[PDB]
Motif scaffolding. Structure first.
Motif, PDB file in Angstrom:
ATOM      1  N   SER A 227       0.866  -1.152   0.000  1.00 27.40           N
ATOM      2  CA  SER A 227       0.000   0.000   0.000  1.00 27.40           C
ATOM      3  C   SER A 227       0.942   1.252   0.000  1.00 27.40           C
ATOM      4  CB  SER A 227      -0.707   0.098   1.346  1.00 27.40           C
ATOM      5  OG  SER A 227      -1.754  -0.884   1.395  1.00 27.40           O
ATOM      6  N   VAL A 228       0.601   2.250  -0.827  1.00 25.12           N
ATOM      7  CA  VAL A 228       1.460   3.453  -0.859  1.00 25.12           C
ATOM      8  C   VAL A 228       0.534   4.651  -1.171  1.00 25.12           C
ATOM      9  CG1 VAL A 228       3.553   2.393  -1.894  1.00 25.12           C
ATOM     10  CG2 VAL A 228       1.772   3.344  -3.422  1.00 25.12           C
ATOM     11  N   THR A 229       1.112   5.841  -0.985  1.00 19.52           N
ATOM     12  CA  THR A 229       0.315   7.023  -1.383  1.00 19.52           C
ATOM     13  C   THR A 229       1.262   7.846  -2.295  1.00 19.52           C
ATOM     14  OG1 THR A 229       1.043   8.366   0.584  1.00 19.52           O
ATOM     15  CG2 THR A 229      -1.179   7.208   0.712  1.00 19.52           C
ATOM     16  N   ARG A 230       0.583   8.660  -3.102  1.00 19.41           N
ATOM     17  CA  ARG A 230       1.264   9.665  -3.954  1.00 19.41           C
ATOM     18  C   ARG A 230       0.433  10.955  -3.775  1.00 19.41           C
ATOM     19  NH1 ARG A 230       2.716  10.425  -9.796  1.00 19.41           N
ATOM     20  NH2 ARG A 230       0.358  10.883  -9.699  1.00 19.41           N
ATOM     21  N   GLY A 231       0.761  11.739  -2.758  1.00 17.29           N
ATOM     22  CA  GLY A 231      -0.063  12.931  -2.464  1.00 17.29           C
ATOM     23  C   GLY A 231      -1.389  12.312  -1.994  1.00 17.29           C
ATOM     24  N   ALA A 232      -2.524  12.882  -2.316  1.00 13.05           N
ATOM     25  CA  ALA A 232      -3.834  12.378  -1.899  1.00 13.05           C
ATOM     26  C   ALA A 232      -4.190  11.097  -2.643  1.00 13.05           C
ATOM     27  CB  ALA A 232      -4.779  13.549  -2.228  1.00 13.05           C
ATOM     28  N   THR A 233      -3.416  10.641  -3.631  1.00 17.43           N
ATOM     29  CA  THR A 233      -3.818   9.423  -4.344  1.00 17.43           C
ATOM     30  C   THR A 233      -3.345   8.161  -3.622  1.00 17.43           C
ATOM     31  OG1 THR A 233      -3.407  10.667  -6.368  1.00 17.43           O
ATOM     32  CG2 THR A 233      -3.694   8.198  -6.604  1.00 17.43           C
ATOM     33  N   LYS A 234      -4.218   7.179  -3.583  1.00 20.68           N
ATOM     34  CA  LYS A 234      -3.978   5.867  -2.985  1.00 20.68           C
ATOM     35  C   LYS A 234      -3.494   4.921  -4.114  1.00 20.68           C
ATOM     36  CE  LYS A 234      -7.917   6.366   0.067  1.00 20.68           C
ATOM     37  NZ  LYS A 234      -9.143   5.734   0.697  1.00 20.68           N
ATOM     38  N   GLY A 235      -2.632   3.985  -3.770  1.00 26.72           N
ATOM     39  CA  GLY A 235      -2.114   3.028  -4.763  1.00 26.72           C
ATOM     40  C   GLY A 235      -1.452   1.802  -4.102  1.00 26.72           C
ATOM     41  N   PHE A 236      -0.956   0.903  -4.947  1.00 25.67           N
ATOM     42  CA  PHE A 236      -0.177  -0.215  -4.469  1.00 25.67           C
ATOM     43  C   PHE A 236       0.948  -0.416  -5.472  1.00 25.67           C
ATOM     44  CE2 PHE A 236      -3.735  -2.792  -6.358  1.00 25.67           C
ATOM     45  CZ  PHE A 236      -2.965  -3.610  -7.237  1.00 25.67           C
ATOM     46  N   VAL A 237       2.097  -0.854  -5.030  1.00 27.41           N
ATOM     47  CA  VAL A 237       3.206  -1.132  -5.989  1.00 27.41           C
ATOM     48  C   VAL A 237       3.068  -2.637  -6.268  1.00 27.41           C
ATOM     49  CG1 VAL A 237       4.646   0.777  -5.353  1.00 27.41           C
ATOM     50  CG2 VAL A 237       4.731  -1.323  -4.090  1.00 27.41           C
ATOM     51  N   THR A 238       3.575  -3.015  -7.457  1.00 29.51           N
ATOM     52  CA  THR A 238       3.443  -4.409  -7.924  1.00 29.51           C
ATOM     53  C   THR A 238       4.473  -4.605  -9.032  1.00 29.51           C
ATOM     54  OG1 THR A 238       1.751  -6.088  -8.560  1.00 29.51           O
ATOM     55  CG2 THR A 238       1.486  -3.999  -9.773  1.00 29.51           C
ATOM     56  N   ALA A 239       4.428  -5.754  -9.698  1.00 35.05           N
ATOM     57  CA  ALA A 239       5.387  -6.027 -10.779  1.00 35.05           C
ATOM     58  C   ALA A 239       4.935  -5.386 -12.119  1.00 35.05           C
ATOM     59  CB  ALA A 239       5.620  -7.519 -10.881  1.00 35.05           C
ATOM     60  N   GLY A 240       5.939  -4.875 -12.850  1.00 38.96           N
ATOM     61  CA  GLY A 240       5.679  -4.265 -14.149  1.00 38.96           C
ATOM     62  C   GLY A 240       5.101  -5.237 -15.159  1.00 38.96           C
ATOM     63  N   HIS A 241       5.617  -6.481 -15.118  1.00 41.87           N
ATOM     64  CA  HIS A 241       5.080  -7.409 -16.135  1.00 41.87           C
ATOM     65  C   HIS A 241       3.635  -7.675 -15.763  1.00 41.87           C
ATOM     66  CE1 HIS A 241       6.301 -10.642 -13.217  1.00 41.87           C
ATOM     67  NE2 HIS A 241       5.229 -11.196 -13.703  1.00 41.87           N
ATOM     68  N   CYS A 242       3.012  -7.425 -14.644  1.00 45.32           N
ATOM     69  CA  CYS A 242       1.610  -7.774 -14.458  1.00 45.32           C
ATOM     70  C   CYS A 242       0.616  -7.042 -15.366  1.00 45.32           C
ATOM     71  CB  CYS A 242       1.171  -7.512 -12.951  1.00 45.32           C
ATOM     72  SG  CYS A 242       2.110  -8.778 -11.973  1.00 45.32           S
ATOM     73  N   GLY A 243       0.883  -5.794 -15.773  1.00 47.35           N
ATOM     74  CA  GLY A 243      -0.085  -5.090 -16.608  1.00 47.35           C
ATOM     75  C   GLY A 243       0.524  -3.963 -17.458  1.00 47.35           C
ATOM     76  N   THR A 244      -0.268  -3.395 -18.343  1.00 45.96           N
ATOM     77  CA  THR A 244       0.251  -2.218 -19.118  1.00 45.96           C
ATOM     78  C   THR A 244      -0.461  -1.028 -18.508  1.00 45.96           C
ATOM     79  OG1 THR A 244      -1.547  -2.967 -20.552  1.00 45.96           O
ATOM     80  CG2 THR A 244       0.764  -3.633 -21.173  1.00 45.96           C
ATOM     81  N   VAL A 245       0.029   0.153 -18.796  1.00 47.66           N
ATOM     82  CA  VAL A 245      -0.540   1.410 -18.314  1.00 47.66           C
ATOM     83  C   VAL A 245      -2.010   1.331 -18.671  1.00 47.66           C
ATOM     84  CG1 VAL A 245      -0.560   3.873 -18.756  1.00 47.66           C
ATOM     85  CG2 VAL A 245       1.562   2.639 -18.366  1.00 47.66           C
ATOM     86  N   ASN A 246      -2.926   1.784 -17.890  1.00 53.89           N
ATOM     87  CA  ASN A 246      -4.338   1.807 -18.030  1.00 53.89           C
ATOM     88  C   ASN A 246      -4.971   0.441 -17.913  1.00 53.89           C
ATOM     89  OD1 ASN A 246      -3.671   4.321 -20.223  1.00 53.89           O
ATOM     90  ND2 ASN A 246      -4.206   4.844 -18.100  1.00 53.89           N
ATOM     91  N   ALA A 247      -4.296  -0.656 -17.746  1.00 50.40           N
ATOM     92  CA  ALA A 247      -5.004  -1.947 -17.536  1.00 50.40           C
ATOM     93  C   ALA A 247      -5.822  -1.818 -16.237  1.00 50.40           C
ATOM     94  CB  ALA A 247      -3.975  -3.047 -17.324  1.00 50.40           C
ATOM     95  N   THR A 248      -6.981  -2.456 -16.164  1.00 49.93           N
ATOM     96  CA  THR A 248      -7.888  -2.425 -15.021  1.00 49.93           C
ATOM     97  C   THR A 248      -7.592  -3.508 -13.998  1.00 49.93           C
ATOM     98  OG1 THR A 248      -9.569  -1.633 -16.517  1.00 49.93           O
ATOM     99  CG2 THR A 248     -10.391  -2.450 -14.402  1.00 49.93           C
ATOM    100  N   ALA A 249      -7.471  -3.081 -12.752  1.00 50.55           N
ATOM    101  CA  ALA A 249      -7.160  -4.050 -11.656  1.00 50.55           C
ATOM    102  C   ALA A 249      -8.469  -4.325 -10.907  1.00 50.55           C
ATOM    103  CB  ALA A 249      -6.171  -3.374 -10.697  1.00 50.55           C
ATOM    104  N   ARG A 250      -8.696  -5.576 -10.532  1.00 53.47           N
ATOM    105  CA  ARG A 250      -9.905  -5.957  -9.816  1.00 53.47           C
ATOM    106  C   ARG A 250      -9.536  -6.777  -8.599  1.00 53.47           C
ATOM    107  NH1 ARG A 250     -11.584  -5.939 -15.253  1.00 53.47           N
ATOM    108  NH2 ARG A 250     -13.540  -4.908 -15.328  1.00 53.47           N
ATOM    109  N   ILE A 251     -10.235  -6.533  -7.528  1.00 49.30           N
ATOM    110  CA  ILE A 251     -10.021  -7.316  -6.302  1.00 49.30           C
ATOM    111  C   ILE A 251     -11.449  -7.817  -5.972  1.00 49.30           C
ATOM    112  CG2 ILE A 251      -9.381  -7.513  -3.842  1.00 49.30           C
ATOM    113  CD1 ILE A 251      -7.126  -5.367  -4.554  1.00 49.30           C
ATOM    114  N   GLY A 252     -11.485  -9.134  -5.912  1.00 52.84           N
ATOM    115  CA  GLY A 252     -12.671  -9.941  -5.621  1.00 52.84           C
ATOM    116  C   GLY A 252     -13.867  -9.540  -6.481  1.00 52.84           C
TER     117      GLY A 252
END
Lengths: 4, 198
Positions: free
Chosen positions: B22-47
């Protein structure tokens, strides 16, 4: 090795 | 969704990866992960629910990415260990020989020690340089997940390894495993991120  | 290191997430309804931190970039929430998992704009889904999209990534060369999440996501300073959690306390980089564990959706929480740094993986897509090698086992799907010491120092996100035909390197001796991770430090400075800690 492979990615993952 | 509650964002915890180690859990599964899918990319564009096809591939699976694991959340790193879990990480933040200013007010934006995010998570770091591996580059090979997706391309820019790919959609991430949890459950089955949309939680964010890939905001940037580098792969091959490096293997890193960050996903910016919607506001409704709950960032937590924790990594899954079975039913329990390992608290993230910071990002001091451990040395060769240090004990380390990793967490991901395919093999769960595995521990071992760091055996080498600045390793090159020759992936089909191109080389990835500067990876640190540990001998904790991992499997297909563990990529992007957390590498952390039991003391809570976040080391990096899983990139790859010498998987056998069963999809992991857990059925071979630790002495023969090569499990690689991308260092967290350069990802935080590259994207201007701050780790969430507790």
């Amino acid at each position: 090795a492979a990615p993952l | 969704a509650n964002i915890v290191g180690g859990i599964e997430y899918s990319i564009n309804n096809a591939s699976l990866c694991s959340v790193g931190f879990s990480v933040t970039r200013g007010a934006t929430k995010g998570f770091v992960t591996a580059g090979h998992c997706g391309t820019v704009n790919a959609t991430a889904r949890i459950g089955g629910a949309v939680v964010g999209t890939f905001a940037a990534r580098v792969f091959p060369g490096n293997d890193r990415a960050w996903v910016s999440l919607t506001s409704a996501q709950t960032l937590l300073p924790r990594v899954a260990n079975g039913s329990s959690f390992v608290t993230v306390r910071g990002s001091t980089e451990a040395a060769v020989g240090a004990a380390v564990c990793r967490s991901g959706r395919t093999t769960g929480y595995q521990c071992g020690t760091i055996t080498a740094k600045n390793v090159t993986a020759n992936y089909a897509e191109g080389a990835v340089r500067g990876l640190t090698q540990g001998n904790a086992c991992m499997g297909r799907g563990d990529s992007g997940g957390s590498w952390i010491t039991s003391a809570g120092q976040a080391q990096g996100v899983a990139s790859g390894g010498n998987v056998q035909s069963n999809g992991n390197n857990c059925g071979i001796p630790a002495s023969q495993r090569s499990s690689l991770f991308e260092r967290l430090q350069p990802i935080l400075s590259q994207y201007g991120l701050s780790l969430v800690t507790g």
